[PDB]
Design a protein around this ligand. Structure first.
Ligand code: HEC
Ligand code: HEC
Ligand code: HEC
Ligand code: HEC
Ligand code: HEC
Ligand code: HEC
Ligand code: HEC
Ligand code: HEC
Ligand code: HEC
Ligand code: HEC
Ligand code: HEC
Ligand code: HEC
Ligand code: HEC
Ligand code: HEC
Ligand code: SO3
Ligand code: SO3
Ligand code: SO3
Ligand code: CA
Ligand code: CA
Ligand code: CA
Ligand code: CA
Ligand code: NA
Ligand code: NA
Ligand code: NA
Lengths: 519, 519
C-alpha cells in the first residue's frame, strides 16, 4: 500500500510546485501517487537533482481516483474502422497516390481510430519505421486497454540489436522522427527540452535516433496533457502550441484578440541547472479548443526544403517542430514566412506543402466557434444521468454516438435524424468538391509528362508548378482535415473552389503550350 | 357527386343556423354534406316542417374533409385488452362480486376499450340486453372500423320479432334503458327531447322500449358531440351535462367560479312546433375537460329507489337521467338532495349508491387541473411532426403510448421511464388501498349473516347499514374511476382511508353485538 511522503520537504526546493499544489484542487493529493523520490530527497541539493526521482506517467496513476474519466477514455469505438487506407475509392482521397506522389504518406495513410491506439498506430504504420515495429500478433489490434498499459506490451521490434531507421518490409518508409512523438505521448515530458532543442539535461531531442526514443515510450495521450497534475487546472504541454500562442504572441484565438485575452495561456517554465528546460501553458479556462489543438493542427514535424533555394531543412532546425497556427487562406503566407516546403511532386516537380489534420485552424471563425462552442461540446460532452454525479465523457469520438448529449443538447428544434441530415448535407457537398478538386489536380498532373515530351519550356512548367502549390494546398487541407467540411462549411467550399480554379488555370496553360509545340 | 344547395333559402327560415354557420369556420361548407333537404324545401313553411329532411350522422360525413382526425379516432388500441372482467384477482376489483351483490354489474363489468366499440360493447355486454345482441361471429370483435360504420353491420339480434327486454342466456341482465344510449351515440340527437322527457316531437324518450331504440342506432361517439356542425365551434350535446352546468347553475368548474366564467357554456335551444325540444351547450373555449364530461362522469341512467321511503324511482322520473356533478366528498349530499339510491345490497340489506367512471369530478382540484391541464393534454395531444401540418390526435388512449407528446411535453426534467415510474407509484399505492378497502368491506359484509343468525337487533343492523353506504361510496368511486388514482392521488388516498375507517367501525359494531348475543 502507498505511504505518503512529507510534501513540505519537497516544497523547500520546489517552490513553483508548492505554489501550484497548495492552491489547486490536488492540494490533498500526496506526491507518492506519482513520484518515488526517496533516494532523490537523500541526495538532492537546492540546485542539483542528485538521484533522479521516478515519475509515473501511466494513465492508471489518475484512474486511481478518476475511474469514470479513465474508463471513458480507454473505450474502443469499434465502429471507427481500423487500418482503413484513405487512398481508396471508398475513403477520403480516392486520387491521393497520384496527388501525393513524392511524399512518404504514399506508403500508407489510414483514417484515425480511437485515441487508445495513437502510439501503437504511430509505431506500426507502414510510413513510419520501415516496418520495424508490428503488433505481436493480429489479435492485438483490438487491445485498447493493452496499448494504454504500454505500447511494448502489444508490439514487437524486428531487430532489438540495431537502432537505425531502415526498411524491414519493401513498401515502407522511415518518416518517423522524434518530433512526431509529441503528439502521441508525453511520457518524455521530463526528458525533452522545449521545442526539442539540444540541451544538456535532455535525453531526447529533435536530432535523436527515433528508434531509440521509441523504445523509451509507452502510453498514449497522457491525462496530464490537458490537466496539470499539481494544480489539477487546465493546461497544455505541447511545445509547438505554446510557441505559437505565447512566444510568437499570436494568441489562443488569433482572429479574436478579445477572446484570446479572456481565454488565454500563461507560459510556465521549469529549469535544469538554472537554465530554462521545459514549459507548460496554463489556461485561463478549461478550453478544449486549445487543449485539442496540441495535436489536431497543421504542423511541421519533419525535415523539408526551403522555398527560396531548395536547400535542405533538417531536424536540427527549429522549423522541423513548428505549428503554423494559420487558417487555410493564411497558410501559404505562413510557409513562405519560414521559407519552407515539404516535398517535390514526383511527376510535376512542384515544391508542395504537406497538410495534416488542421481541425483547430479550420474551426476558427465558424458559426459554432463564434458562438463559443468548443471541441468538447461535440466530442467530449457531459454525461446525462437520471440519477448520478455528472462527469465529462472522455471518449473522444463522433457526436453521432451521443446526439442527445452533443447536438440535440443545443438544437432543441431538431430530432436526431434531422441533425444527422444536416451533418450529411455538409459532408456530402464537401466530399463532392474534394473529389472534383482531385479530378482537376490529376488532369493537370497528367499533362506534365506530355508537356515535357512536347518540349514545353521550363518557364511554362514553372508557372504551372506555382499553380500546383495553390491547387494542392486548397485541396489537401480538406482531405487532411477530419470533419469533411463540417467544422467550417463555408471555408471548405471557398477553398475547394479555389483549388479547382487553380488546377483549371494550369490545365489551360499546359494544354495551350503543348498545342503550340504541336502547331 | 354532391351538388350544393342554396343555403340562403334555408336561412330564410333557419335564422339560428344562419347566425352560427355564416360566422364560423364552416361558412363555406354546404348543407348537402350532411342534409338531404330537397323534398323538405319544396314543402316547408317557416311554421311547418313539411317533409322531414334526412340528416347524416355517420362519422364519414366529417372524414370527407378531416381524414386525419377520423383515422386517429377509429384506431383500435390492441393493447387495451378486450372483454376483460374487472371482478377478477388480476383486474381492478378482486372482490367486486361480494361487494356489488344485488346490482346488475355482477353479471359483467369489463374494462373499457377503444372508443370505436362503445356502442357495440354496450349492446353485447352480459348485463345490458339479456344476451339478445351478439357479434355476428367471434372474428368481428376486432372490427373497429366496422363498428364505426354501424353497429348493425357487425351484430345480430336473437329475435327480431320481439322488442321486450328478456334473458336469452341464463346469466345475463336487462339493465339497458334509453338513457344509456346518450353516452354511446348521438344518432338520436333530432329524435330525443332534452333530458328524454316525453315530447310530441320525440320518437324516443326515457320510457321507450330500449330494444326498439337500439335498432335505430348505429354510430359511436359522433364527431358532432364535441364540435357544432354549423359553426365548427366547441360544444357539448349531452342533456345531463347541460342540465348540471347551466340549468342547475353549478358551472363548468363547480369549485372555481372564475374558471367557470372564463370557460363557460351557453345553452342553445331548438324548437318543434314552437315548443322547446332539444338543446346544446356552446363552449367559450375548446375545453376538453367539459367535452369529455359528457360521458366520463358519475350519473343516474337507471331506475332506483328513494332513500326516504324506499319507493321505486322509475325511468319516467327525471332522476333517471341525472349528472350529479359532485366530487366524492359531496356525492352523498347530492344523492340525499334528489332522494335516491341505486340498489339494496343482497347480503347486508343496505341501501347503496352505484358509482360509474367519475373521471371529470375526480380531476377537479388536482394539481394538474388547478394548473390548467385538461383531458386532451394527456389523452388527445397534438401530433409532433418533423415536417407537416399539426393536428390533434383523436386516438383517446393512455398517455403511455405517446409520452413525448403528452407528459414529457410539459415535464422536461424527466425521461420517459421516470414519468412512467411516477404514474406507477400513484397507481400502485392507490390500488393497494382499493384492495385493503375491499378486504374490510368484505369482512363487514360477511358479519351480516352471522349477526342475523345470532339475533343482533335491527337497530344495530341499520347502524351498520348506514356505515355500509359510506364505506361503499368511498371505495367504489375508485374502482369506477379509471385512473387508479392518477387523476387525483390525494383525494383517492383520503377517500379510501375513509372507506377503511367506516368498514372498521362497522366491523367493531357488529362483532361487539354478536359477542353480546353469545354472552
Ligand atoms: C532540494 C534539496 C530538493 C528536495 C528537498 C526535493 N527536490 Fe526534487 N529536485 C531538486 C532539484 C534541484 C531538481 C532538478 C530541477 C530543478 O528544479 O533544479 C529536482 C527535480 C525533481 C523532479 C524532476 C525529475 C526529472 O526527471 O526531471 C521531480 C519529479 C522532483 N524533483 C520531485 C521531488 C519530490 C516529490 C520531492 C519531495 C519528496 C522532492 N523533489 C524534493 C531538488 C529537490
Ligand atoms: C486521488 C488520490 C487523486 C489522484 C491520484 C488524482 N486526482 Fe485528480 N482530483 C482528486 C480530487 C480529490 C479532486 C477534487 C475534486 C473536486 O471537484 O473538488 C481532483 C480534481 C481533479 C480535476 C478537476 C480540476 C478542476 O480544477 O476542476 C482534474 C482535471 C483532475 N483531478 C485530474 C487528475 C489527473 C490528470 C490525475 C493523474 C495525473 C489525477 N487527477 C489524479 C483526486 C485525485
Ligand atoms: C501533432 C501536431 C502531430 C504530429 C507532430 C504527428 N501527428 Fe500523427 N496524428 C495526429 C493527429 C491529430 C492524428 C489523428 C487525425 C488524423 O488525421 O489522422 C494523427 C494520426 C496519425 C496516424 C494514424 C492515421 C494514419 O495516418 O495512418 C499515424 C500512423 C500517425 N499520425 C503517424 C505520425 C508520424 C509518423 C508522425 C511524424 C512524421 C506524426 N504522426 C506526427 C497528430 C500529429
Ligand atoms: C495528441 C496527444 C492528441 C490530442 C491532445 C488529441 N488528439 Fe484526437 N487524435 C490524436 C491521434 C493521434 C488520433 C488517431 C489515433 C489512432 O490511433 O488512429 C486522434 C483521433 C481522434 C478522433 C477520432 C476517433 C475515432 O473514433 O476515430 C477524434 C474524434 C479526436 N481525435 C478528437 C479529439 C478531441 C476532441 C481532442 C481534444 C479533447 C483530441 N482529439 C485531442 C491525437 C490527439
Ligand atoms: C478454433 C477452431 C478457431 C476458430 C473457429 C477461430 N480461431 Fe482465430 N485463432 C485460433 C487459434 C488457435 C489461434 C492462435 C492463438 C495463439 O495465440 O496461438 C488463432 C489466431 C487468430 C488470430 C491471429 C492470427 C495471426 O496473428 O496471424 C486472429 C486475428 C484470429 N484468430 C481471429 C479469428 C476470427 C476473427 C475468427 C472467426 C472469423 C477466428 N479467429 C476463428 C483458433 C480459432
Ligand atoms: C485533453 C485532450 C484532455 C485529456 C488528455 C484528459 N482530459 Fe480530462 N477533461 C478534459 C476536458 C475538456 C474536461 C471538461 C472541462 C470542463 O470544465 O468542461 C475534462 C474534465 C476532467 C475532470 C473533471 C471532472 C469532469 O468534468 O469529468 C477530470 C477529473 C478529468 N478530466 C480527468 C481526466 C483523466 C483521469 C484523464 C486521463 C484518463 C483525462 N482527464 C484526460 C480534457 C482532457
Ligand atoms: C460540433 C458543433 C463540433 C465541434 C465543436 C467540433 N466538432 Fe469535430 N466533428 C463534428 C462532426 C459532426 C464531425 C463529423 C463526424 C461524423 O460522424 O460524420 C466531426 C469530426 C471530427 C473528427 C473525425 C471524427 C470521425 O470521423 O470519426 C475529428 C478528429 C474532430 N471532429 C475533431 C475536432 C476538434 C479537434 C475540434 C475542436 C477544434 C472539433 N472537432 C470540434 C462536430 C464537431
Ligand atoms: C321555411 C320555408 C324553411 C326552409 C326554406 C327550410 N326549412 Fe328546414 N325546417 C323548417 C321548419 C319549420 C322545420 C321544423 C323545425 C322548426 O324549426 O320548427 C325545419 C326543420 C329542419 C331540420 C330538422 C329536421 C329534423 O329531423 O328534425 C333540418 C336538418 C332542416 N330543416 C334543414 C334545412 C335545410 C338544409 C334547408 C335548406 C336546403 C332548409 N331546412 C330549408 C323550415 C324551413
Ligand atoms: C369539407 C367540405 C368539410 C366538411 C364535410 C367538414 N368540415 Fe370541418 N372544417 C372544414 C374547413 C374548410 C374548416 C376550416 C379550417 C381552418 O382551420 O380554417 C373546418 C374546420 C373544422 C373545425 C375547427 C373549427 C375551429 O377551430 O373553430 C372542426 C372542429 C371541424 N371542422 C369539425 C368538423 C366536423 C365534426 C364535421 C362533420 C360534422 C366537419 N368538420 C365536416 C371543412 C369541412
Ligand atoms: C355517460 C354518463 C354514460 C352512461 C349514461 C352510460 N355509460 Fe356505459 N360507459 C361510459 C363510459 C365513460 C365508459 C368507459 C369507462 C368505464 O369505466 O368503462 C362506459 C363503459 C361501458 C361499457 C364497457 C365496459 C363495461 O362495463 O363492460 C359498457 C358495456 C357500458 N358502458 C354499458 C352501459 C349500460 C348498459 C348503460 C345504461 C344502463 C350505460 N353504459 C350508460 C359512460 C356511460
Ligand atoms: C360518450 C359519448 C364519451 C365521450 C364524449 C368520451 N368517452 Fe371516453 N369512453 C367512452 C366509452 C363508452 C368508453 C368505453 C368503450 C368500450 O367499448 O369499452 C370510453 C373509453 C375511453 C378510454 C379507454 C380507451 C382504451 O384504450 O381502453 C379513454 C382513455 C377515454 N375514453 C378517454 C376519453 C377522453 C379523454 C374523452 C374526451 C376527449 C372521452 N373519452 C370522451 C365514452 C365516451
Ligand atoms: C385454417 C386451417 C385456420 C386456422 C389455422 C385458423 N383458423 Fe380461425 N377460422 C377458420 C375458418 C375456416 C373459420 C370460419 C370462417 C367463416 O366465417 O366461416 C374460422 C373462424 C375463426 C373465428 C370465429 C369463431 C366463431 O365465430 O365461433 C375466430 C375467432 C378465429 N377463426 C380465429 C383464429 C385464430 C386466432 C387462429 C390462430 C389461433 C385461427 N383462427 C386459426 C380457419 C382457420
Ligand atoms: C370530444 C370528445 C371530441 C370528439 C367527439 C371529436 N373531437 Fe375533434 N377535437 C376535440 C378536441 C379536444 C380538439 C382540440 C381542440 C383544441 O383547440 O385544442 C379537437 C380538434 C378537432 C379539429 C381541429 C383541428 C385539430 O386540432 O386537429 C378538427 C377538424 C376535429 N377535431 C375534427 C373531428 C372529427 C372529424 C371528429 C370525428 C372523427 C372529431 N373531431 C371528434 C375533441 C373532439
Ligand atoms: C395527464 C396529466 C392526464 C390528464 C389531464 C387526464 N388523464 Fe386520464 N389518465 C392519465 C393517466 C396517467 C392514466 C393511467 C393510464 C395508464 O396507462 O396507466 C389515465 C387513465 C385514464 C383512463 C383509463 C385509460 C386506460 O386505463 O387505458 C380514462 C378513461 C381517462 N384517464 C380519462 C380521462 C378524462 C376524461 C380526463 C379529463 C377529465 C383525464 N383522463 C385527464 C393521465 C391524465
Ligand atoms: O517548483 S519547480 O520549479 O521545481
Ligand atoms: O501524421 S500525423 O500528423 O497525422
Ligand atoms: O355502465 S357505464 O356507465 O360504465
Ligand atoms: Ca475514425
Ligand atoms: Ca504539415
Ligand atoms: Ca382500457
Ligand atoms: Ca351512478
Ligand atoms: Na468513421
Ligand atoms: Na454562446
Ligand atoms: Na390497459
Amino acid at each position: 500500500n502507498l505511504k505518503p511522503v512529507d510534501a513540505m520537504q519537497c516544497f523547500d526546493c520546489h517552490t513553483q510546485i508548492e505554489d501550484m499544489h497548495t492552491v489547486g484542487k490536488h492540494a490533498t493529493v500526496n506526491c507518492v501517487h506519482c513520484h518515488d523520490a526517496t533516494e532523490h530527497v537523500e541526495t538532492a541539493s537546492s540546485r542539483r537533482m542528485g538521484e533522479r526521482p521516478v515519475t509515473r506517467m501511466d494513465l492508471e496513476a489518475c484512474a486511481t481516483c478518476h475511474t469514470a474519466q479513465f474508463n471513458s477514455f480507454v473505450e474502443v469505438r469499434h465502429e471507427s474502422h481500423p487500418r482503413l487506407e484513405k487512398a481508396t475509392p471508398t475513403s477520403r482521397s480516392p486520387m491521393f497516390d497520384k496527388l501525393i506522389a513524392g511524399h512518404g504518406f504514399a506508403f500508407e495513410h489510414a483514417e484515425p481510430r480511437s485515441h487508445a491506439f495513437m502510439l501503437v498506430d504511430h509505431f506500426v504504420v507502414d510510413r513510419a519505421y520501415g516496418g520495424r515495429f508490428q503488433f505481436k500478433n493480429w489479435q492485438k489490434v483490438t487491445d485498447g486497454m493493452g496499448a494504454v498499459r504500454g505500447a511494448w506490451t502489444v508490439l514487437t521490434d524486428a531487430d532489438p540489436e540495431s537502432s537505425d531507421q531502415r526498411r524491414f518490409l519493401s513498401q515502407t518508409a522511415t518518416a518517423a522522427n522524434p518530433v512526431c512523438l509529441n503528439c502521441k505521448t508525453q511520457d518524455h515530458i521530463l526528458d525533452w527540452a522545449y521545442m526539442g532543442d539540444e540541451h544538456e539535461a535532455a535525453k531526447w531531442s529533435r536530432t535523436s535516433e527515433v528508434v531509440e526514443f521509441a523504445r523509451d515510450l509507452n502510453h498514449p495521450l497522457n491525462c496530464f496533457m490537458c490537466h496539470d497534475p499539481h494544480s489539477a487546472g487546465p493546461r497544455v504541454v505541447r511545445d509547438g502550441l505554446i510557441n505559437a500562442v505565447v512566444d510568437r504572441g499570436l494568441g489562443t484565438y488569433p482572429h479574436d484578440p478579445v477572446k484570446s485575452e479572456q481565454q488565454g495561456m500563461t507560459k510556465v517554465t521549469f529549469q535544469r541547472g538554472r537554465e530554462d528546460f521545459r514549459a507548460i501553458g496554463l489556461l485561463d479556462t478549461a478550453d478544449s479548443n486549445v487543449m485539442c489543438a496540441q495535436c489536431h493542427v497543421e504542423y511541421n514535424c519533419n525535415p523539408g526544403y526551403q522555398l527560396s533555394d531548395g536547400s535542405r531543412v533538417g531536424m536540427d532546425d527549429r522549423r522541423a517542430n513548428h505549428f503554423f497556427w494559420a487558417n487555410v487562406f493564411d497558410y501559404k503566407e505562413a510557409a513562405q514566412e519560414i521559407d519552407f516546403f515539404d516535398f517535390r511532386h514526383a511527376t510535376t516537380g512542384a515544391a508542395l506543402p504537406k497538410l495534416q489534420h488542421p481541425e483547430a485552424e479550420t474551426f476558427w471563425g465558424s458559426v459554432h466557434e463564434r458562438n463559443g462552442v468548443a471541441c468538447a461540446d461535440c466530442h467530449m460532452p457531459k454525461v446525462q444521468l437520471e440519477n448520478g454525479k455528472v462527469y465529462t465523457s472522455h471518449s473522444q469520438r463522433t457526436p453521432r454516438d451521443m446526439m442527445g448529449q452533443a447536438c440535440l443538447n443545443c438544437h432543441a428544434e431538431w430530432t436526431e435524424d434531422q441533425a444527422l441530415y444536416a451533418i450529411d448535407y455538409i459532408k456530402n457537398y464537401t466530399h463532392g468538391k474534394i473529389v472534383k478538386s482531385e479530378y482537376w489536380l490529376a488532369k493537370m498532373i497528367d499533362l506534365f509528362p506530355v508537356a515535357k515530351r512536347a518540349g514545353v519550356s521550363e518557364d511554362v512548367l514553372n508557372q504551372a508548378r506555382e499553380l500546383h502549390y495553390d491547387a494542392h494546398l486548397y485541396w489537401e487541407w480538406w482531405t487532411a482535415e477530419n470533419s469533411v467540411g463540417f467544422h467550417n462549411p463555408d471555408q471548405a467550399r471557398e477553398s475547394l473552389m479555389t483549388s479547382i480554379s487553380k488546377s483549371k488555370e494550369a490545365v489551360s496553360l499546359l494544354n495551350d503550350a503543348i498545342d503550340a509545340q504541336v502547331a
